[PDB]
């Protein structure tokens, strides 16, 4: 009857059930259009860092299209398997196989292309807000202008047309194959599988706690440990759902006797049998959630890392190594109404033996312990400490170094001079820096010696491992003032860019990690929405599968105000377990290696976890509103 009317009614019915699908499609099209418009913007080159700036957006776009193209293809194969009782009926009524295809592939192209056409119109309104968000994290005061950038339209249209062709191919393959006309007790294996899964997860957690502690110290021995940790955790997570929930469910069940209330009857019938059926999807969700949270948290810590480490890398506000350039810069500062405080200090490069002061293992070489390059400075130059003869004090913190190189209390240090050796003892480790990073190799600390000892050590001055400049010419600045014009003066001093400045090595790091945060945050948002929609589309089937149970339960006196109160806990257990496993994974991943980027945790991690939990909880709250409708019509 009136095939047009049938198609229209089916379209209006589909628009009511799958509205989250339409929302996800519109949001994905909006983000893709926004990124492609932003990539070709000529104002994107104001971002300067190691990453070019217009070659990271090109990577983000390609990474996003895969996340969208997997969700679309999985949703469109969940959908079609709920239209089989209609396909068989249409085949036995008398219709062919090339008319059902046209009936059910003309009620879907309308929805798809309407959502696509709406998404492009709402992807032009927010194209400038993305620019303005980017030009606030990586500090830039350029101007953003609203435009269309036609180049993005072609790309979006081509991409989504290709995805639609894939969907049509998959539907046509399904129709011709599954067409025809045809409309417990626990075992010993499950116990072993559950125990194995839990043991594997615990072992994977334990091994990661060592890594950069004392052992595995070889540039290739680490990779084996990392591969073992990842493989063990993934396999344990996969086996946690097949067998390790049935075991605990059996314990909880045969730990009650026979007294079960309505909530437990509704609960211990889904997650004993249906959580097992979904093992390859929940595993993916948990691992990718953990990855996103960990990466975002580390990228956030890298900010305060940048600030403090860039303050530490150059001791003074500026660093110089050529006397002519330094004198020219100070003359230029003189007439600029800027009074500079200048103080220089010579440094001695020598090797000493400190093998006896590490309390760890000999495997921590990083060079010969008896030939380590250290820096020696006088005691009159330092205005804070006044050591005595036969005494030495260390300098620098380098939170990485303490965790990797453990320093004992007072020991013995042998001065490896040409023909003499004066032993000293370790007094203590200081907290401030005194010399730039270039002289002290990577991050090796520096020692403090007495003026009397210096008076002879500088006289010795073995010229075998000395560098070009044994001095720390570096100009400070006056009290808090306008440092920007001083930076401009310094920039025009060095056309060869051979000197370093305090507030230019503290900007490349900010730009790089701000770009990283931007990309990871947007990809995490997209994956969050995708996983929420996919997990919401299964509770529909799980609900019309449990409809008979509600019917029988309502002839024994139970009312809707009790069935819904029991469903509100099943819908908590079905949505909370992957979240908790992902949170544990993230916590035990971040803590293992947080001392490689920054120097502070528990600040960003909590906030990222709370935001993720809030959005996931919205997507979880939206399903009781469907369970209520199912229960209402089962009298």
């Amino acid at each position: 009857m009136n095939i047009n009317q049938l198609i229209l009614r089916n379209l209006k019915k589909n628009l009511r059930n799958y509205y989250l699908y339409v929302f996800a499609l519109i949001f994905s099209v909006a983000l893709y259009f926004a990124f492609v418009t932003l990539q070709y913007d000529p104002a994107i080159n104001e971002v300067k860092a190691s990453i070019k700036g217009a070659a990271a957006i090109k990577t983000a776009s390609i990474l996003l299209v895969a996340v969208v193209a997997i969700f679309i293809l999985y949703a469109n194969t969940i959908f079609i398997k709920r239209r089989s009782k209609e396909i068989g009926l249409f085949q036995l009524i008398g219709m062919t196989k090339h008319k059902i295809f046209r009936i059910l592939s003309a009620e879907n192209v309308m929805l798809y292309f309407g959502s696509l056409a709406i998404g492009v119109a709402a992807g032009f309104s927010i194209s400038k807000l993305v620019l303005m968000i980017l030009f606030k994290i990586v500090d830039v005061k350029a101007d953003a202008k609203l435009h269309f950038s036609e180049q993005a339209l072609v790309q979006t249209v081509i991409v989504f047309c290709g995805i639609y062709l894939l969907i049509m191919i998959m539907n046509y393959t399904f129709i011709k194959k599954q067409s025809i006309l045809s409309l417990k007790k626990i075992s010993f294996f499950q116990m072993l599988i559950g125990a194995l899964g839990i043991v594997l997860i615990l072992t994977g957690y334990y091994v990661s706690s060592e890594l950069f502690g004392g052992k595995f110290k070889t540039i290739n021995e680490l990779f084996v440990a990392m591969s073992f940790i990842l493989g063990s955790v993934i396999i344990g997570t996969f086996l946690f759902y097949k067998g390790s929930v049935t075991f605990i469910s059996n314990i909880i069940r045969k730990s009650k006797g026979g007294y079960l209330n309505i909530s437990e009857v509704l609960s211990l019938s889904s997650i004993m049998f249906r959580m097992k059926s979904n093992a390859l999807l929940l595993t993916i969700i948990t691992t990718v959630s953990a990855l996103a949270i960990g990466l975002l948290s580390l990228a956030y810590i890298s900010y305060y890392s940048s600030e403090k480490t860039a303050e530490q890398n150059v001791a003074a506000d500026f660093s110089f190594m050529n006397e002519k350039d330094a004198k020219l810069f100070e003359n230029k500062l003189r007439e600029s109404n800027i009074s500079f405080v200048k103080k220089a200090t010579p440094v001695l490069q020598a090797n000493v033996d400190i093998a006896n002061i590490m309390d760890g293992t000999p495997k921590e070489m990083q060079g010969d312990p008896g030939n380590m390059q250290l820096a020696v400075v006088s005691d009159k130059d330092v205005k804070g400490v006044d050591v005595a003869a036969g005494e030495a004090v260390f300098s620098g913190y380098t939170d990485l170094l303490q965790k990797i190189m453990v320093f004992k209390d007072s020991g013995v240090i042998k001065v490896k001079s040409k023909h003499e050796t004066q032993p000293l003892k370790y007094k203590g480790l200081r907290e401030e820096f005194l010399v730039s990073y270039t002289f002290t190799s990577g991050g090796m600390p520096a020692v403090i010696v007495d003026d009397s000892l210096f008076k002879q050590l500088d006289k010795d001055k073995d010229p075998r491992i000395q560098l070009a400049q044994s001095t720390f010419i570096g100009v400070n600045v006056k009290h808090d003032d306008q440092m920007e014009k001083a930076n401009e003066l310094f920039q025009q001093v060095n056309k060869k860019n051979e000197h370093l400045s305090r507030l230019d090595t503290s900007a490349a790091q900010k730009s790089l990690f701000g770009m990283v945060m931007f990309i990871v945050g947007f990809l995490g948002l997209t994956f969050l929405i995708t996983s929420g929609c996919i997990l919401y589309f299964k509770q529909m089937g799980e609900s019309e599968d449990e409809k008979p149970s509600y019917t029988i339960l309502r002839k024994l006196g139970f009312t809707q105000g009790d069935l819904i109160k029991g469903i509100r806990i099943k819908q908590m257990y079905n949505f909370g377990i992957p979240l908790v496993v992902g949170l544990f994974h993230s916590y035990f991943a971040v803590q293992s290696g947080w001392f490689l980027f920054g120097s502070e945790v528990w600040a960003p991690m909590i906030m990222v976890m709370v935001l993720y939990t809030a959005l996931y909880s919205i997507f979880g709250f939206l399903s009781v509103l469907y369970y209520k409708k199912v229960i209402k019509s089962s009298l």
Partner: protein, 334 residues
Amino acid sequence: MIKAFLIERRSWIAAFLFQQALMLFIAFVDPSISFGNVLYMVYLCILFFIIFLWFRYRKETAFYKSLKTWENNLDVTAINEPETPFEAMVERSIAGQTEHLKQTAARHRLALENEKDELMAWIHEVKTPLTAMHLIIDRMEEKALKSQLSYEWLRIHLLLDQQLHQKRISFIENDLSVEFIQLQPLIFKEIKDLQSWCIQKGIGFDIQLEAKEVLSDAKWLAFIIRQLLTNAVKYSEASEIEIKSFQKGEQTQLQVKDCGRGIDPKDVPRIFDKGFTSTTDHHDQASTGMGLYLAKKAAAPLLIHIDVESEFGAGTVFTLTFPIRNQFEHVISV
């Protein structure tokens, strides 16, 4: 209604707050828009929104209170006058339901009144052949057969009169006619009416009327006297019934006393009950027990009090206290 008002309008305050947050965010993320001015304007608009919400609540939460006080009370005018379109529909629904109720009730009452009128017409059509039978039969020669037939005819006529007065007791108030009534001719007529029963039962009558005139309605008072005399004759055998009327105080009192079986003291309070019958004898089963109830109910609009004094095995005394002359002036005024 504050909680109800803020649970019905929970979808507009959220929109307002989201709009404010969007404005603040877009102002924050730009360098060309000062933040402080936007903060000040957000604050001022929040306060003005509070005041606006107060006014709109006070204006809007009235008609529903009016309809909720309409549903369970005794005033149809509890609903206030609707002002916004979303109230006129509810008003129309209520008006339509009330109109349907009134129309159905009026039609049903009219139909039942017509049925009652047809029923009393049939009562008249039944009572007429009784008069025809009386006219045909008032030519007898045998004394005993004539006495028996007249007794039965008088019983049937009394039953028909009782039924007619039962029908008319619902509108006696529309039948009241206040005028002075000569007691002696009325009592003589009542005695002549019940002559056959006294002849068969050997019942005598003595008339002692100190008071000759009373103020009441002729027809209903005559019916009450006839009912009392019929009950006295039926409940008495071969005894003299004493009818006395005397003026006590400012009211006229009529006393009807017989020397019959009397009334049981346990049954004295229940003689005026509707449908009451004596349980001692099976001869009283055929008695309707409704004449006394009709007489007592019809006596109230006549301002006549019925007093009864009975002794078991000795006799029954019925007293009728006529009203004061000035007590009917208020009735005539209305």
